[PDB]
Structures are given as C-alpha cells and as structure tokens.
Amino acid sequence: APVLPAAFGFLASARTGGGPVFATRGSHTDIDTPQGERSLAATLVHAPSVAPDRAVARSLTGAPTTAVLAGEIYNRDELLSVLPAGPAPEGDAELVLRLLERYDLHAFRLVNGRFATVVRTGDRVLLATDHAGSVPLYTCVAPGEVRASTEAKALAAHFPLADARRVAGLTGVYQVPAGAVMDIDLGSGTAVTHRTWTPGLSRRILPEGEAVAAVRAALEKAVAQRVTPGDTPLVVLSGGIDSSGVAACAHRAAGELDTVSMGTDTSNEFREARAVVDHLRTRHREITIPTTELLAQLPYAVWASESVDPDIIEYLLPLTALYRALDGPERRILTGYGADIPLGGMHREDRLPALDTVLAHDMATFDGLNEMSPVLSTLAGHWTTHPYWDREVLDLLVSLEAGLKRRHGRDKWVLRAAMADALPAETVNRPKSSFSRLLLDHGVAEAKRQVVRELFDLTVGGGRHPSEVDTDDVVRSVAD
C-alpha cells in the first residue's frame, strides 16, 4: 500500500483565554491538550489509513513545546546526520523539533521537503513553509491569539501582518510566504518573518557532460526520496519530456510503476504516453473526460486551490478532474509539473536573453499561485509531490546558464539529454478554450475573474461545498 504523509493539513490555534471544514478529504483527529488552553490545540486532517502520531511532536526543551506538521521531509538522512545522541525521531514533526533545539528557527534553512508546520514553544509561535511553499499555510494573528491552517477557508469561517500577503477575497487572513518562517510573540501578537530560501540569481557554467550528469543524478535522487521503499507509485503521464523523465526515475527507484493519462473530447496525449508505457512496461490507464464535465470542475478547482486567478484555475481544471476520476485506493502520485519554469520550457526563439528574463520573473512571482498545493489531489484522498520543484533539483535547474536550456535548437535540452539513455528517442526529442468558449456562448468576446471570484466567495469565503454550486447559474448571473 502507498505510504502517505502522517497528515495532509491542519487547523491549529494558540491562546491564553477562550467545526473545521476542509477541502482535503480524510479523517480528523484532535490532538491532546495537556496544559489546557495554554497548550497548542489543533485538528489534523489525514488519510484514514495513517496514524496522525508522526505528525505531532512534543518536548520540554526550552519550555513546553508542541509541533504539528503537514506533509513530509525528503532530505531525512542529511538532517539526522547533524543531530547529536543517537535515538532518532519517530516522525518528521519530531525531526523538526530536534532541529529547532539545535538551530532554532534556522532549522528551516536546512529542510528540503513538502510541508507546512506550526510550533508552539512557551508563548512563542513559529509558522513555517517549505522552500517553495508547495503546501499552503495561512494565519490570523492578534494579541494573545494565533490561528494557523493549511486552508484559508478554515480561517474565513471565524492586526495586519507585514511581510505576508493578504488572501484575496478574504479579510484578516494572511498567507505565510514561501520559504519562510514567521516568529510570533503570542502576547503582543507581533510577528517577524525570516526567509529560509530564495531563488538563485546567478548562473553556473558547466560542460555538457557534467551538466547532463548532474541533472540526471539530481532528478533520480529527488524522485527516490519521494517513492516508498517497496510500494509502486503512480505517475501522471503526459506526452512530454517532463512527466516521462519522472516516470523513468520512479520506475528505477521502485522497480515497477503505475501510470495514468487524462484526455478530453478535444485532445489527449495517449499515443505519446504509450511510447513510454511500453518502453518501461508500466500498468497504464487512460481517462477521457468530456469538456462539459471538465468545466464542472470550476467550483472544485477554486475550492481546492483557494485562488481567484482565472489563469491558474483554468490550468488546474484538468488536474482536479483527473484526481477525482482516479479509481481504486488512495495513492502516492508523482508529477512532472514545473519543469518549464526553471528550464524556460515556454521559450521558443533561439535568442537566450528572453529566456533568462522570463525565468527570473517567474521565479520571483510563483509564490501565492498555489499551483502545487496538495489539496488539488487530497480532495480525492490522493497525495501528490513534484520532483522538479525539489529544493536541490530546483536550485540546479535554475542555476544553469541559458545555453544549457536552449541548445542544439531544442528546449529544455539538458533535461532531454539527461534522460536520453532511459527513454525512447521519440519521447526525448518530442517538442511542445473550453472555458472561454462557455462564456463566449453567453457574452461579448471583449471577465472570467468575476466568475471565479463568485465561486471563491461561495466555496472559500462563504462555506458552500462545490457540489452545491451550479456552475451554469453562476456564469448566468455573470452575463453583462
């Protein structure tokens, strides 16, 4: 069975004085509160098949301390190597606690993972995200009261924070920045934010051979860290080098591999994916979803991503549909998402300047889009992780000089070359609107924001389940 994180998300609170609803599907467990209202209270959302235990750690080092962690840590061996004594932590929450005892908040500068965590030590509260904030974390801060959650909707049902961004569509709710740690004084309700990672701005030079081998090694490691020892993972397969590169690495680390490809009545990438399916001999499945059913995902996409950006929602529609269409038990899924950002995959010309311009811009503006949120798949009970945005892989891909990304007249060159000896030639060299038409059949060409914002106000700001939101009637009201 596919091992899943000890927890997918949570709603926590720290107070001195005085019904959690999540988009994430799964069980709920409230942790114990030893010292009453002085303890960190919290409700964890997790898979019915996992015990929440590993997601919660307690200690008395420094003062009464409690840590709750959603997600997982990948560079575990590295982290264990810098700790004293011998008895290793039982889970990632305890590992964080051990690191905090040694480096304090600087512990987070060392972590390569996919997590969100809240820690209470005495009357001090720490809120931390992974380097890319791949697991969203939100908070409400006021003198003597701190509430944190992996879903803004859990805080909407209920003092402006500097350095943090206000959740669009909501009031009083802030999103913790990616790659950061907020150090909050419970008493005064004052917070200080420290960034624990930032995109590299310099570029590195390497001969083709070394560069290709470095990318291959990095991807293999990030994928291996993401696959359970003896369990077969599921990879969302597309017709590009992105997902195919991940599949080759997962198949090697696991020995076997399950794959799935989604298509619509408008298009699909089944033929391209089949080449990889047969080359690696994986257990493949094809899912085709009508355009109509695809647009019916609108309410769920905004509900799960908690985004009001139409472009983001439009991109996530096919993904949310696929995850919900998956049949069988809960699964650990790896995807080829985000490879285009650091590699400038959307760059078409051979002139390198524009490639770096767009790359630098993308890397300084990814935070807040929530494109990699686990909720996109956990709403259906599935756990997703993305190798290309692994901290080590990401740093390496970003650092490479543009000539290694656009070389020999091919995009994402270093990646293609890195997987050449593990995939068919066609897959390696293979190069690379309903929603707009829906409204096109109602209003002037001239917009969608109001449509998405409406859904957001109903599902995120309000409190209505997507199944209770008529996607048609919403667009109806948005006529003129």
From Swiss-Prot:
GO terms for cellular component: cytosol. Pfam families: Asn_synthase, GATase_7. It catalyses: N(2)-(2-carboxyethyl)-L-arginine + ATP = deoxyamidinoproclavaminate + AMP + diphosphate + H(+). It comes from the Bacteria. Binds 1 Mg(2+) ion per subunit. Its EC number is 6.3.3.4. Its cofactor is Mg(2+). Signal peptide: none annotated. PANTHER family: ASPARAGINE SYNTHETASE (PTHR11772), ASPARAGINE SYNTHETASE [GLUTAMINE-HYDROLYZING] (PTHR11772:SF2). This is Carboxyethyl-arginine beta-lactam-synthase. It comes from Streptomyces clavuligerus.
